[PDB]
Amino acid sequence: NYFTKSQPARAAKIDRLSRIAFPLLFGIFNLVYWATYLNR
Amino acid sequence: VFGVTTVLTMTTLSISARNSLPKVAYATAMDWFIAVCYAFVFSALIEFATV
Amino acid sequence: NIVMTQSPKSMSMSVGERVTLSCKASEYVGTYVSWYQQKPEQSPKLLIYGASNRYTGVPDRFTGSGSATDFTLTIGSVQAEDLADYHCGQSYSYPTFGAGTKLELK
Amino acid sequence: GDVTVILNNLLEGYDNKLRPDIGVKPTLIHTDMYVNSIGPVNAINMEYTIDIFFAQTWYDRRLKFNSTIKVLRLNSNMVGKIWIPDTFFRNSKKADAHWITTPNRMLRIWNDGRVLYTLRLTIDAECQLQLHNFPMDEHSCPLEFSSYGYPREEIVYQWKRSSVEVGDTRSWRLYQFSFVGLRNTTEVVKTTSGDYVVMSVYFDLSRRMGYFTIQTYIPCTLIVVLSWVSFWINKDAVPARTSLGITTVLTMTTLSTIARKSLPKVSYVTAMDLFVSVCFIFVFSALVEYGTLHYFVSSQPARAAKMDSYARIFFPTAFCLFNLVYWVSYLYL
Amino acid sequence: MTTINTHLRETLPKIPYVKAIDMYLMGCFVFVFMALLEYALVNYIFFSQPARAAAIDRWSRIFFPVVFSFFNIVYWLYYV
Amino acid sequence: LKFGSYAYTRAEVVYEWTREPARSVVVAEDGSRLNQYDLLGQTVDSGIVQSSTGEYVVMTTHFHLKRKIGYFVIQTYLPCIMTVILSQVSFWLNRESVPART
Ligand SMILES: *[C@@H]1O[C@H](CO)[C@@H](O[C@@H]2O[C@H](CO)[C@@H](O[C@@H]3O[C@H](CO[C@H]4O[C@H](CO[C@H]5O[C@H](CO)[C@@H](O)[C@H](O)[C@@H]5O[C@H]5O[C@H](CO)[C@@H](O)[C@H](O)[C@@H]5O)[C@@H](O)[C@H](O[C@H]5O[C@H](CO)[C@@H](O)[C@H](O)[C@@H]5O)[C@@H]4O)[C@@H](O)[C@H](O[C@H]4O[C@H](CO)[C@@H](O)[C@H](O)[C@@H]4O[C@H]4O[C@H](CO)[C@@H](O)[C@H](O)[C@@H]4O[C@H]4O[C@H](CO)[C@@H](O)[C@H](O)[C@@H]4O)[C@@H]3O)[C@H](O)[C@H]2NC(C)=O)[C@H](O)[C@H]1NC(C)=O
Ligand SMILES: *[C@@H]1O[C@H](CO)[C@@H](O[C@@H]2O[C@H](CO)[C@@H](O)[C@H](O)[C@H]2NC(C)=O)[C@H](O)[C@H]1NC(C)=O
Ligand SMILES: CN1C(=O)CN=C(c2ccccc2)c2cc(Cl)ccc21
Numbered sequence: 069n070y071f072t073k074s075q076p077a078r079a080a081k082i083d084r085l086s087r088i089a090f091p092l093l094f095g096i097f098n099l100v101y102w103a104t105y106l107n108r
Numbered sequence: 109v110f111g112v113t114t115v116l117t118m119t120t121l122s123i124s125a126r127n128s129l130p131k132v133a134y135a136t137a138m139d140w141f142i143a144v145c146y147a148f149v150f151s152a153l154i155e156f157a158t159v
Numbered sequence: 160n161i162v163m164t165q166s167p168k169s170m171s172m173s174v175g176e177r178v179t180l181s182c183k184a185s186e187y188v189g190t191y192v193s194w195y196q197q198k199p200e201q202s203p204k205l206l207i208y209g210a211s212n213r214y215t216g217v218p219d220r221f222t223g224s225g226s227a228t229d230f231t232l233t234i235g236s237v238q239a240e241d242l243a244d245y246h247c248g249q250s251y252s253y254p255t256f257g258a259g260t261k262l263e264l265k
Numbered sequence: 266g267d268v269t270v271i272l273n274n275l276l277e278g279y280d281n282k283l284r285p286d287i288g289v290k291p292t293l294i295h296t297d298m299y300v301n302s303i304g305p306v307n308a309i310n311m312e313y314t315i316d317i318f319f320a321q322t323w324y325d326r327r328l329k330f331n332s333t334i335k336v337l338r339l340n341s342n343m344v345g346k347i348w349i350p351d352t353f354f355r356n357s358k359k360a361d362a363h364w365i366t367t368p369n370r371m372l373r374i375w376n377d378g379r380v381l382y383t384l385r386l387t388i389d390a391e392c393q394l395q396l397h398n399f400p401m402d403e404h405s406c407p408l409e410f411s412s413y414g415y416p417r418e419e420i421v422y423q424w425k426r427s428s429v430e431v432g433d434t435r436s437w438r439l440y441q442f443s444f445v446g447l448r449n450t451t452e453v454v455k456t457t458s459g460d461y462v463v464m465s466v467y468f469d470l471s472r473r474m475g476y477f478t479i480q481t482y483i484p485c486t487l488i489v490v491l492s493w494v495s496f497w498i499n500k501d502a503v504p505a506r507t508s509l510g511i512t513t514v515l516t517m518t519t520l521s522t523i524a525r526k527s528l529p530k531v532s533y534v535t536a537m538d539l540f541v542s543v544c545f546i547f548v549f550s551a552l553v554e555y556g557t558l559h560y561f562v563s564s565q566p567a568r569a570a571k572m573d574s575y576a577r578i579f580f581p582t583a584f585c586l587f588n589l590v591y592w593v594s595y596l597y598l
Numbered sequence: 599m600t601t602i603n604t605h606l607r608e609t610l611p612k613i614p615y616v617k618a619i620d621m622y623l624m625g626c627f628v629f630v631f632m633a634l635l636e637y638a639l640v641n642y643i644f645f646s647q648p649a650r651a652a653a654i655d656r657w658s659r660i661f662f663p664v665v666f667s668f669f670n671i672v673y674w675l676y677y678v
Numbered sequence: 679l680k681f682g683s684y685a686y687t688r689a690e691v692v693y694e695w696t697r698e699p700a701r702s703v704v705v706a707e708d709g710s711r712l713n714q715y716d717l718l719g720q721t722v723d724s725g726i727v728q729s730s731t732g733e734y735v736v737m738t739t740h741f742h743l744k745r746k747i748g749y750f751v752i753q754t755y756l757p758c759i760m761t762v763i764l765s766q767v768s769f770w771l772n773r774e775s776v777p778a779r780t
């Protein structure tokens with residue numbers, strides 16, 4: 069929101085990047101956490 | 109936000125009010141009052157939706 | 160059926176040296192492992208009843224060390240009367256013994 | 266046998282209503298404790314649980330026998346047939362012995378008349394906790410005992426040289442506290458019935474801030490940073506910043522209320538109330554600052570342009586300075 | 599819906615399996631959650647085409663009560 | 679579950695299991711009031727405690743328990759995941775709806 073009306077392309081780029089980086093990172097955290105706490 | 113927050117407040121009042129008396133299977137007079145008040149609040153939101 | 164594996168299968172040793180015998184259990188045996196000594200053409204004699212308790216009439220050179228699965232029997236100043244076979248046996252369940260270790264002199 | 270005749274000869278002409286040396290000298294009682302565990306120290310009722318093996322030893326010239334056996338080792342069956350001191354714990358709210366499966370008591374009489382009496386007790390003792398500096402606080406609150414009816418001229422207590430022994434200290438029920446040490450004390454107190462010899466054991470405890478940290482110190486600071494993020498949002502989206510600020514206020518109130526239910530209903534300010542109070546103030550100041558911003562963009566824009574840019578650096582520095590001064594001032598005490 | 603669920607949970611004991619009332623609350627929550635996701639989907643493609651957006655909106659207006667009534671009859675016929 | 683003798687040392691009263699130690703502590707089949715855990719088995723032992731008054735026989739029994747995750751999943755781990763997903767759904771709304779994403 070702060071980057072709109074000054075650099076719209078950067079705001080669009082970081083919202084499209086964070087549209088796919090967040091589910092991947094949360095899934096990787098879920099896999100690592102459940103793997104380390106179910107095989108413990 | 110008027111309609112939805114008053115519906116939330118009615119829900120909270122109903123759950124927080126039914127814990128005083130035991131777990132009887134019939135309706136009391138506070139239950140009828142709460143039901144009619146909930147109907148009025150929900151009806152106000154539905155009238156807003158129609159308008 | 161708790162199996163006790165005793166090591167080594169055969170050992171040799173001189174007089175006046177420290178010696179260590181080991182017994183390993185497959186399952187849990189708390190402190191109910193006993194050590195018996197059997198001379199040739201004789202009946203076995205209980206040396207250590209339970210984990211680390213000497214029987215009445217055993218010299219103070221035998222001493223045992225216990226755990227949940229790993230058990231040890233150590234003799235200190237070894238004389239010429241420790242030339243015998245040594246069995247470890249568990250009593251947590253129906254009793255099973257080890258194979259034995261025959262000490263010899265060389 | 267022989268123990269039966271000895272025990273029957275000791276109890277003939279015996280009066281368990283009279284202490285030894287009833288008109289000669291006071292009775293000297295040597296006391297030992299073994300703390301099995303110090304239970305949960307809840308501050309709501311200002312109390313703490315403790316489990317001990319209380320051992321007493323004294324001399325009874327009536328229980329003196331001549332025989333080839335040196336010691337009679339008995340159960341609790343004969344405890345009620347000889348004289349037993351009336352020791353009671355002065356700062357206990359509730360205390361009970363143990364009776365499963367048989368009364369957990371022990372009596373041992375020696376060849377010269379020395380009696381040793383041991384029993385297992387679970388005490389729910391009382392200690393007023395000065396709950397300032399909470400939760401960075403340290404306490405030392407006692408377990409006291411004395412005789413109930415016999416004054417200083419009739420019963421005298423005395424510690425041994427190996428008086429109090431703690432156990433493993435790891436199987437104890439101290440969740441929020443940490444044992445650091447102990448010290449014994451003996452004194453004489455004046456009472457309406459007479460002067461009594463009172464013995465105290467002070468246990469020193471220190472509160473480990475590991476639960477209150479992840480319960481209140483981390484989330485309230487996170488909610489403050491949540492209120493901080495409103496400054497980088499555009500000044501034209503008025504419902505966004507207002508809703509953010511007031512919902513942040515909601516979260517602060519709910520967290521404060523749910524956080525105050527740990528400690529008792531004390532009337533003074535602690536080191537935990539001040540923190541959550543200042544966090545609420547910070548959120549209040551952020552919202553009122555945006556309010557004055559929205560009024561000033563309409564009144565005169567020359568003053569409201571660089572106010573938000575000033576707030577963006579003034580709020581974190583003020584909060585960080587508050588945190589530094591607060592933590593040093595409350596960890597120096 | 600979360601408030602409703604929280605109030606109920608404190609009464610019941612810590613049992614692992616899913617009760618019938620918990621099943622109903624999960625159904626109601628999944629319904630209101632998919633309603634919010636449907637709004638997110640209509641808002642994502644609103645500037646590009648309004649025809650598909652209006653079609654999804656009027657399809658939701660008819661197919662959410664029908665699927666809810668189907669879930670309600672399946673629930674009140676399996677647990678009775 | 680440790681039990682032993684009060685007032686009687688090891689040279690006076692000793693304890694022992696009446697059957698084989700693996701078969702002495704017997705838990706019934708329908709005997710389980712557990713809601714949150716799962717009993718896996720039993721484990722006995724026997725030892726000696728060294729007190730200020732002598733050595734005492736102590737019989738130990740360990741019951742092995744395993745916590746059931748089914749309650750805590752539905753209580754915390756599934757609502758946390760659903761709330762994280764609800765936060766992530768804000769990335770799909772348009773940049774012109776600032777109070778919505780706020
Ligand atoms: C208001 O009313 C209240 C209700 O009436 C009242 O409370 C009662 O107070 C009295 C007096 O304080 C209590 O009486 C004593 O209890 C002592 C043990 O107490 C605790 O245990 C009881 C239960 O009693 C049982 O269990 C013990 C231990 O196993 C047994 O020894 C008892 O016999 C009794 O056993 C029966 O029941 C068991 C099941 O529970 C069975 O398994 C068992 O087989 C029996 O059937 C609890 O109720 C108590 O709880 C209370 O008090 C505590 C205090 O802190 C509270 O915290 C708690 O909340 C409860 O309120 C507690 O847990 C007994 O030891 C004692 O018996 C002795 O002393 C008297 C006086 O000298 C003797 O006459 C009597 O014979 C007993 O003596 C012998 O045994 C002792 C053992 O230590 C020996 O040392 C002694 O030498 C003597 O041995 C002789 O006899 C033996 C045979 O008996 C023989 O073998 C020996 O060789 C020798 O000859 C006494 O009974 C009473 O229990 C309370 N009841 C309740 C319900 O609370 C309250 O005080 C009133 N208040 C006022 C102000 O008036
Ligand atoms: C418990 O009390 C005893 C005596 O009341 C304390 O004992 C003394 O220890 C000092 C050295 O630390 C000796 O010089 C004294 O002679 C001891 N007293 C006696 C009577 O022998 C003991 O230190 C106390 N334990 C504490 C405070 O933990
Ligand atoms: C009920 N409540 C709130 O709403 C948040 N702010 C308050 C407060 C805020 C500023 C000054 C004084 C008190 C507060 C402080 C505590 Cl220690 C516990 C609950 C609580």
Ligand SMILES: CN1C(=O)CN=C(c2ccccc2)c2cc(Cl)ccc21
Pocket residue numbers: 299301318432682683684685727728729730731734
């Ligand atoms: C090592 N030890 C003591 O010295 C105090 N008395 C003993 C004891 C006292 C009487 C009978 C059996 C054992 C005891 C009991 C426990 Cl439950 C933990 C530690 C401990």
Ligand SMILES: CN1C(=O)CN=C(c2ccccc2)c2cc(Cl)ccc21
Pocket residue numbers: 599600602603620623624627751752753756757758760761
């Ligand atoms: C276990 N569970 C979910 O996983 C879906 N999200 C949750 C949730 C989300 C946030 C807070 C509390 C609960 C929820 C709400 C209900 Cl009314 C029933 C089941 C249910």
